From a paper:
To determine the molecular origins of these processes, we compare here wild type β 2m and its [name] mutant, to investigate the correlation of thermodynamic stability and conformational flexibility versus aggregation propensity. β 2m is a single-domain protein, characterized by a seven-stranded β -sandwich fold typical of the immunoglobulin domain family; β -strands within the protein are named from A to G. β 2m is the light chain of the major histocompatibility complex (MHC) class I121314. While β 2m is highly stabilized by the interactions within the MHC class I15, when β 2m is released as a monomer, it may turn into the etiological agent of dialysis-related amyloidosis, a condition triggered by renal impairment and the subsequent chronic accumulation of abnormally high concentrations of β 2m in body fluids. β 2m deposits in joints, bones and muscles, lead to movement impairment, bones fragility and articular pain1617. The introduction in the DE loop of a residue endowed with higher conformational freedom, such as Gly, relieves the local conformational strain and results in a β 2m variant thermodynamically more stable in solution, with a decreased aggregation propensity. The three β 2m surface mutants that we rationally designed (V85E, [name]-[name], [name]-Y63W) were produced as recombinant proteins, purified to homogeneity, crystallized, and their structures determined at high resolution (1.75 Å, 1.49 Å, 1.70 Å, for V85E, [name]-Y63W, and [name]-[name], respectively).
Residue numbers in the entry: 0 to 99
């Protein structure tokens, strides 16, 4: 058996074809096993609607999750990603850094 804790990156992107759109992204990468819970949070509250979740695996069976959705950030709001995984003794919460 193998277990590997996910790497977690939280960042924002505009599609180049439409700069009127801002997306918040959680890239959860390289994890074993694939069982996982991933949420985006705004000011500590779960964002229910997340339009996109792209899931893949590598040759060695590691999982790669891109979880992302359109959002309209203000300087006031705190965004974060909350991950629950067998490798984590408590849920891991990773904040969005505004300048990313």
């Amino acid at each position: 058996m193998i277990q590997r804790t996910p790497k977690i990156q939280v960042y924002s992107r505009h599609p180049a074809e439409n700069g009127k759109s801002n997306f918040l992204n959680c890239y959860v990468s390289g994890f074993h096993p694939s069982d996982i819970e991933v949420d985006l949070l705004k000011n500590g509250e779960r964002i229910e609607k997340v339009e996109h979740s792209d899931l893949s695996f590598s040759k060695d069976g590691s999982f790669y999750l891109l979880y992302y959705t359109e959002f309209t950030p203000t300087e006031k709001d705190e965004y974060a990603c909350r991950v629950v995984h067998v490798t984590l003794s408590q849920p891991k919460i990773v904040k969005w850094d505004r300048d990313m």
